[PDB]
Design a protein around this ligand. Structure first.
Ligand code: 4C4
Ligand code: MG
Ligand code: ZN
Ligand code: ZN
Lengths: 1166, 458
């Protein structure tokens, strides 16, 4: 039964140090000349940094001398010119090597911060260099003599001390030393010593340093690597066709910088190699070596010294180092992110004949896009002899092909994506409708997801090729399945703006209208009553109608009624489907309510019949708009009748407060602060002036006297509807327009009292600038900042899939409605819908299991919950989820844009990360960074302290800059005494027992504590309840899960407290423990032990702890990761997401979930 | 901190000189020559080798004159061989013609190449001696458990014969009896040793000393010159401070300089009142300039090419002000020995030329080479068709006589390997040649119906 040898579905990646022999396993040869190409006959001279003799033929299947040019003589090597003939593709694969005159030192490990060559020698930085540039000799194995090994002498000393001990000690200088040094040390050794001293001395700086040192070490041993290797003797050179030497037009040339850089090492080396044979004076060759080690590090990570310039050009050259892709951090940096075939884009417009599952793509793009499918399909039906020609037909745009193409298209969706791809919806699959124009046409309803208007936004398109994709495209990405924001249960495919004006319009009622009070059979005769010119839309009318209600056993029950409604609202009811209450359209309908109508149709008749509703909800919503002829002309913007009146009234107050100020009844900061209120009040009144008047003054009259009703002025109906406007903005059209604050931040004690319908005067405008400018500026930034944020989250969620089914723990968190002092800042129902419980729920009274253990709370359930007065709930949430290395479905909850519980595999991490960082843009200590404060885990400036331990308190010693405070346990050993700076105000009661985690100073508190002290179900509520005050404040609906799930990553680490097998103090993944304690619990031995303590880790600091090193080395400092990762010879067993993408295999979630699983079992399988 | 200062500061140990320590050395050098010259003047096989090649270069600069001195030399040897073997004047006065001969050896120079050979040849031959010698000790001292105290007293006498071997076994000491287990080995090493006494034609005993006095003589001078150069670090810089930034970075020219320096010290002769420096300058300006031009641009380039350039570069800047405008290659070549395109061909290989990793816009910080399209690779719809070609064609050959098909396909490698000569295609099939030709043409006659391939054409 064979292993293998050849090539195979490998997995996982090993990185490590590089044996010289091993390196030589790589080179097809030693570059040894600094030449390039010929100079006249632009051939490549062998053998030198481009060659063929080594790297490969230039031209597919062709020897260099050229004796052998046939697709015949392949693996042959020209007798003359060291060339196997093969494709030229090798000279982009093959590598080289060079032998060095002097062993020479690897700049990554010598400086990539904690210098491996450093701490491994436990020998300081400054010296080694000192040894290297030949400043001073260093001891090595001095043996029983007079001196330590890693000790160092000056020349003279070395000489003095040479004369005393002839041999029997060793001292060198120059690379070889360190080379000498490493080869020679034995690790295994120090450790056991290091091991003891760890045990011999008990001190925190120490075991911090010590045990932390050792932990690095035996890692190295565990690697495989050899520290003699951190030094270079042979150097691999990257293949030529990647540091190419292309010709340009006008036959100037261009190449990558490595070639300069290369040419430098080669040069020095040789001349040096040369020098030896001249037996040149060691004063020079010393210098030479010193130069070589320059050229090298020039090569490798230019920037860690004097920074070799670019030749020719001022500017600095490009070191391998610099050419690492991903590269990033810290931080940035986007990744554009490869370009791509089958793709394109343009300007986009409306298209409202579009049924939500489609979009209008222009004949012309659609042509060039699907070109091959066309080439094939053409010759299949055999309208074309052969493709060559098939091309010519489409080249010719023959009429036939247009018809054809239609065929290729039929059920063939394409991808449509817009500007900054935020949440997964930034890409949505449509079926395409062929179209003239070079515009893309958009389904309006969708606009609102992408965020696209039509003032020039361009959306770009893609093609799903694979059979697969066409399903992926159709099942998941297809327009329709995305209509519940995965951010937050509500529909996202709500009635936008143009429309709800129409709807709102219809579902309205004028006091005394063309038909006030008749009665019609049903809407059928209702509309007929209209297009006939007989009724007004909104003339009140009773009508016969039927709603249905599927109240009974899954079953649809009908019901007729003489509902007392309007004509419009009648006519709408035509659109509504079955199991909906007429009650739903009875009223006026805001966009506020009308999305809510939509959700409901979905949570009761579900997808399809929610959808086709929504198109029809639109199609209509436009039509009565256009019919209504709403439009705005100056006359609509009513400046309240009494505006100017008050102004002068409050204009009074001020001359008053002035009088008093100069009479110094009252002060300046006083006065100011006084005045500015009254201006404030006025604006509230000149606000609520018009709004009181604008609102309703529609005073009209039926049969009798006068009645007044909610107006029909064109603009009210805008804001009233939710189409557009904000009474905040109105107030700027009619009444006074706010107050401007000058740049200071310091608001100006004289509001912009005029408005838009009136002139603005110079000065009015002017102050008005700075503002709108600052604003623009803000947005420009908040958006730069929103981003870098998300980049971090997804950086850290991500590798997180809904893996386990139901972890099966009873452990959950406790939900209360939010109640911020006054009124409930947010209901308990919103919080809890969609979660799955810990334990069965009892009524008010008891023995009454309402809901049983873990149930997924639907709407009904809730409604049941709300009927019973029910009021707080323990719930399953992913910080609870016992499942390790994933997230049980049950611990989670339900959401999707689809309604039912999460399905295994979905990538909830990302889709968490998304729904946060996305709306972040619109944020306003506080606001955005105040957010980063949550997740970054930053202590505030001045943090409270709390009852460290429960137990009675007492103050000991005195004021010595800090008062030691000694808590005293009723039972336990009392000794807790903390040293506190008393130059801040206390709170605690002085002879009082203090429940650990009480307020012992007041002011902000630092989460790590709350965690540590108060608890997880505690902290975990802090992070959210407080992230939540921000978004909530901003009308921004994000559901808690997501945050929790971030939080979860925050606390991936934990600190042990005892042992048996781990290493006593260490900081480790609650993961690996949760597994390892298990492996002792009934497993091997109790041994013992171990216990831990959970740690709060800042997101960013969380991320950079990825089992996957590829993953992580994309987020932070890179140069580091590799450097530090290659030394402990890590392996990356894949599994994570990105890493699989980089190396471009298949995603282990999504679809690819179903697949990977199928393999991981075969790994460790027999 | 920074390589350059180190070199400087390193050089800081001034160690300046006057005329005195100047010449004072030059002899110290020269001694080590003779001392070694003399040292080597001593070697029979150094000279008997001199004979063998002489016979090889003469069996294949005035030849007859060369034929003459070889006689004086050739004469003076054979006599001396008898002042040994005939043992007249027991290496006292027979010693003297041995000396006369060596004198003959001590005059005139040669070719440094055969030299380092002999130098080597001696010492490699010296190797085999301590080669065979390193054998006997591990086999008697460490092997026979025999003390090294007793090994140097008796072996040292001869170091070739077996006088100590069979005299350390009869001493009836406790370490003696062990010497037997190596009797096949000791016999074999003393053999090759005396053999060297035969190959060398000199006692292994006396052959060390001479080789050494070279070796030291070696040091004396080695040591010496080293000193000389260190004197003039400062020289090099000055001048090398000239050639700077010329498509070559500092330390480089200067290293090279200290080569050009270090060279000069060799070819010199202090017996020349010409003062040492200005003899350096040349040999320094030598390497550092000739250094530059051949290794400085990313494409090499011949010299004259360099010069023929700067001829232009200078002229054009000379030309410019003449015609305070602008110089056109016709004009420029005019002012020239030069043809013209020959010039134009010249222009193009200047320019160093630009780095692909140059920045261009910042449309998304682009890079140059982010834009160089490939030209090798084949288009997909371009490759695909090809695929249609083999097929649709293979689609056709089947419609023909299975005998003709294999006759075309042979002519065109198709589905096969090398394209078969439209002759030798016969020869394989016999019925040559013309015979087959007709068959060929029969194919082509079918293109009544090639609406397939016809179209795969354009
Ligand atoms: C050497 C150490 C770093 C390794 C990397 C990052 C190497 C990157 C190369 C070689 C690319 O050129 C490249 C790619 O290979 C792939 C991509 C895609 C845009 C993937 C980016 C997002 C990944 N996924 C993620 O975040 O989880 C959701 O964009 C690139 O620029
Ligand atoms: Mg826009
Ligand atoms: Zn060849
Ligand atoms: Zn769970």
């Amino acid at each position: 039964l064979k292993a293998q040898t050849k090539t195979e579905e490998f997995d996982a990646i090993k990185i490590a140090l590089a044996s010289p022999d091993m390196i030589r396993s790589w080179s097809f040869g030693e570059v040894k000349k600094p030449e390039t190409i010929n100079y006249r006959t632009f051939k490549p001279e062998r053998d030198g940094l481009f060659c063929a003799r080594i790297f490969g033929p230039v031209k597919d299947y062709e020897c260099l001398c050229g004796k052998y040019k046939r697709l015949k003589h392949r693996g042959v090597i020209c007798e003359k010119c060291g060339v196997e003939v093969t494709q030229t593709k090798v000279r982009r694969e093959r590598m080289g090597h060079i032998e060095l005159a002097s062993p020479t030192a690897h700049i990554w490990f010598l400086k990539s911060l904690p210098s491996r060559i450093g701490l491994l020698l436990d020998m300081p930085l400054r010296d080694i260099e000192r040894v290297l540039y030949f400043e001073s000799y260093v001891v090595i194995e001095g043996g029983m003599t007079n001196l330590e090994r890693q000790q160092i002498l000056t020349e003279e000393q070395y000489l003095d001390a040479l004369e005393e001990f002839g041999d029997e000690f060793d001292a060198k200088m120059g690379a070889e030393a360190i080379q000498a040094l490493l080869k020679s040390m034995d690790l295994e050794q120090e450790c056991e010593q290091l091991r003891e001293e760890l045990n011999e001395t008990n001190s925190e700086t120490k075991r911090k340093k010590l045990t932390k040192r050792i932990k690095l070490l035996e890692a190295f041993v565990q690697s495989g690597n050899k520290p003699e290797w951190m030094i270079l003797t042979v150097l691999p050179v990257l293949p030529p066709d990647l540091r190419p030497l292309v010709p340009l037009d006008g036959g100037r040339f261009a190449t990558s910088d490595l070639n300069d850089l290369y040419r430098r090492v080669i040069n020095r080396n040789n001349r040096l190699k040369r020098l030896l044979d001249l037996a040149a004076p060691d004063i020079i060759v010393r210098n030479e070596k010193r130069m070589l080690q320059e050229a090298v590090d020039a090569l490798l990570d230019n920037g860690r010294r004097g920074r070799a310039i670019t030749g020719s050009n001022k500017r600095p050259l490009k070191s391998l180092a610099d050419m690492i892709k991903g590269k990033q951090g810290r931080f940035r940096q986007n990744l554009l992110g490869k370009r791509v075939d089958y793709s394109g884009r343009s300007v986009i417009t409306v298209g409202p004949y579009l049924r939500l599952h489609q979009c209008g793509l222009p004949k012309k793009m659609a042509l060039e896009l699907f070109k091959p499918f066309i080439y094939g399909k053409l010759e299949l039906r055999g309208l074309a002899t052969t493709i060559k020609a098939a091309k010519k037909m489409v080249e010719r745009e023959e009429a036939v092909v247009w018809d054809i193409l239609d065929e290729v298209i039929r059920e063939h969706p394409v991808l449509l994506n817009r500007a900054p791809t935020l949440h997964r919806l930034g890409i949505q699959a449509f079926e395409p409708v062929l179209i003239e124009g070079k515009a893309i046409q958009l389904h309006p309803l969708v606009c609102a997801a992408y965020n696209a208007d039509f003032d020039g936004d361009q959306m770009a398109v893609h093609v799903p090729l694979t059979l697969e994709a066409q399903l992926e495209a159709r099942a998941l990405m297809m327009s329709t399945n995305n209509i519940l924001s995965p951010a937050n249960g509500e529909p996202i495919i709500v009635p936008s703006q143009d429309v709800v004006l129409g709807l709102y319009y219809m579902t309205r009622d004028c006091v005394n209208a063309k038909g006030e009070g008749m009665v019609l059979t049903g809407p059928k005769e209702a509309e007929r009553l209209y297009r006939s010119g007989l009724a007004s839309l909104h003339a009140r009318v009773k009508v016969r109608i039927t709603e249905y209600e599927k109240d009974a056993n899954g079953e649809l029950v009908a019901k007729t009624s003489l509902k007392d409604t309007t004509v419009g609202r009648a006519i709408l009811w035509m659109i509504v489907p079955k199991g909906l209450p007429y009650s739903i359209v009875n009223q006026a309908l805001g966009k506020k309510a009308i999305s809510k109508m939509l959700n409901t149709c979905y949570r009761i008749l579900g997808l399809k019949p929610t959808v086709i509703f929504a198109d029809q909800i639109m199609y209509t919503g436009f039509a009565y708009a256009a019919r209504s002829g709403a439009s705005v002309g100056i006359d609509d913007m009513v400046i309240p009748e009494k505006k100017h009146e008050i102004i002068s009234e409050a204009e009074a107050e001020v001359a008053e407060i002035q009088e008093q100020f100069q009479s110094g009844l009252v002060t300046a900061g006083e006065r100011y602060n006084k005045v500015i209120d009254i201006w404030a009040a006025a604006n509230d009144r000149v606000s609520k002036a018009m709004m009181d008047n604008l609102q309703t003054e529609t005073v009209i009259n039926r049969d009798g006297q006068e009645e007044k009703q909610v107006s029909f002025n064109s603009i009210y109906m805008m804001a009233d509807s939710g189409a557009r406007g904000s009474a905040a903005q109105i107030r700027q059209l009619a009444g006074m327009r706010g107050l401007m604050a000058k740049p200071d931040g310091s608001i100006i004690e004289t509001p912009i009292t005029a408005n838009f319908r009136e002139g603005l005067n110079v000065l009015q405008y002017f102050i008005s600038t700075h503002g709108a400018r600052k604003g623009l500026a803000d947005t420009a930034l908040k958006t730069a900042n929103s981003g870098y944020l998300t980049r971090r989250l997804v950086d850290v969620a991500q590798d997180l899939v809904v893996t386990e089914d139901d972890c099966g723990t009873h452990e959950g968190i406790m939900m209360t409605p939010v109640i911020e002092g006054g009124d409930v800042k947010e209901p308990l129902r919103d919080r809890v819908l969609g979660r799955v419980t810990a334990e069965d729920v009892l009524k008010p009274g008891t023995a009454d299991i309402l809901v049983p253990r873990n149930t997924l709370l639907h709407e009904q359930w809730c409604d049941l919950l709300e009927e019973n007065s029910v009021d707080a709930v323990k719930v399953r949430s992913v910080v609870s989820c016992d499942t390790d290395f994933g997230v049980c479905a049950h611990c989670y909850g339900r959401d999707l844009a689809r309604g039912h519980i999460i399905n295994k595999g979905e990538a909830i991490g990302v889709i968490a990360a998304q729904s946060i960082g996305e709306p972040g843009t619109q944020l306003t200590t506080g606001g955005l960074p105040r957010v980063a404060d949550l997740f970054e885990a930053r202590r505030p400036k001045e943090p409270a302290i709390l009852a460290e331990i429960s137990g009675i308190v007492s103050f000991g010693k005195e004021t010595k800059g800090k008062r030691r405070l000694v808590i005293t346990p009723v039972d336990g050993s009392d000794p807790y005494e903390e040293m506190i700076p008393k130059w801040r105000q206390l709170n605690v009661f002085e002879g009082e027992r203090v429940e650990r985690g009480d307020v012992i100073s007041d002011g902000p508190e630092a989460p790590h504590d709350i965690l540590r002290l108060r608890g997880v179900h505690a902290v975990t509520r802090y992070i959210v309840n407080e992230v939540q005050d921000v978004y909530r404040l901003q009308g921004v609906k994000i559901n808690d899960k997501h945050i929790e799930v971030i939080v979860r990553q925050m606390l991936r680490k934990a600190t042990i407290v005892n042992a048996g097998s781990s290493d006593f103090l260490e900081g480790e993944q609650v993961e690996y423990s949760r597994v390892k304690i298990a492996n002792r619990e009934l497993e091997a031995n109790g041994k013992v032990g171990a216990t831990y303590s959970r740690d709060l880790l800042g997101i960013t600091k969380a991320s950079l702890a990825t089992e996957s090193f590829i993953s992580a080395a994309s987020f932070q400092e890179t140069t580091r990761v590799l450097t530090e990762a290659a030394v402990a010879g890590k392996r990356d067993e894949l599994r994570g997401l990105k890493e699989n993408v980089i190396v471009g295999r298949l995603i282990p979630a999504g679809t690819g979930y179903a697949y990977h699983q199928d393999r991981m079992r075969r790994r460790a399988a027999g | 901190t920074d390589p350059v200062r180190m070199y400087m500061r390193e050089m800081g140990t001034v160690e300046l000189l006057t005329r005195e320590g100047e010449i004072d050395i030059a002899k110290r050098i020269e001694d080590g020559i003779n001392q070694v010259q003399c040292s080597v003047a001593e070697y029979p096989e150094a000279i008997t080798y001199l004979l063998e090649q002489y016979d090889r270069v003469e069996a294949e600069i005035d030849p007859e004159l060369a034929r003459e001195k070889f006689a004086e030399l050739r004469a003076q040897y054979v006599v001396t061989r008898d002042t040994i073997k005939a043992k007249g004047r027991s290496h006292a006065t027979a010693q003297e013609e041995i000396l006369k001969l060596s004198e003959v050896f001590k005059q005139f120079r040669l070719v440094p190449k055969q030299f380092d050979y002999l130098v080597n040849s001696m010492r490699v031959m010296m190797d085999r001696v301590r080669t065979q010698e390193r054998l006997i000790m591990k086999l008697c001292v460490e092997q026979c458990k025999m003390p090294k105290k007793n090994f140097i007293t008796l072996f040292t006498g001869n170091e070739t014969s077996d006088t100590w071997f069979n005299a350390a076994i009869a001493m009836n000491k406790p370490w003696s009896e062990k010497l037997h287990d190596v009797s096949e080995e000791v016999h074999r090493a003393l053999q090759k040793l005396q053999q060297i006494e035969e190959e060398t034609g000199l006692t292994i005993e006396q052959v060390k000393d001479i080789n050494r006095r070279m070796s030291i003589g070696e040091a004396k001078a080695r040591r010496a010159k080293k000193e000389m150069v260190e004197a003039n670090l400062r020289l090099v810089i000055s001048i090398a401070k000239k050639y700077t930034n010329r498509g070559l970075q500092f330390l480089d020219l200067i290293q090279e300089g200290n080569i050009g320096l270090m060279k000069a010290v060799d070819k010199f002769e202090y017996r020349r009142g010409y003062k040492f420096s200005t003899y350096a300058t040349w040999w320094i300006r030598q390497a550092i300039t000739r250094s530059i031009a051949d290794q400085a641009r990313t494409i090499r380039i011949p010299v004259h090419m360099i010069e023929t350039i700067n001829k232009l570069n200078r002229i054009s800047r000379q030309m410019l002000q003449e015609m305070g405008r602008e110089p056109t290659p016709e004009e420029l070549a005019e002012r020239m020995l030069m043809p013209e395109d020959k010039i134009r061909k010249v222009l193009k290989i200047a320019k160093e030329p630009i780095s692909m990793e140059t920045p261009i816009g910042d449309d998304e910080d682009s890079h140059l080479g982010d834009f160089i399209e490939d030209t090798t690779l084949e288009l997909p719809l371009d490759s695909a068709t090809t695929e249609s070609l083999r097929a649709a064609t293979h689609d056709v050959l089947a419609g023909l006589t299975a005998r003709e098909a294999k006759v075309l396909r042979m002519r065109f490698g198709i589905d096969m390997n090398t394209d078969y000569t439209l002759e030798e295609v016969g020869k394989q099939f016999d019925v040559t040649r013309e015979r087959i030709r007709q068959i060929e043409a029969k194919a082509l006659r079918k293109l009544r119906h090639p609406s397939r391939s016809e179209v795969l054409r354009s």
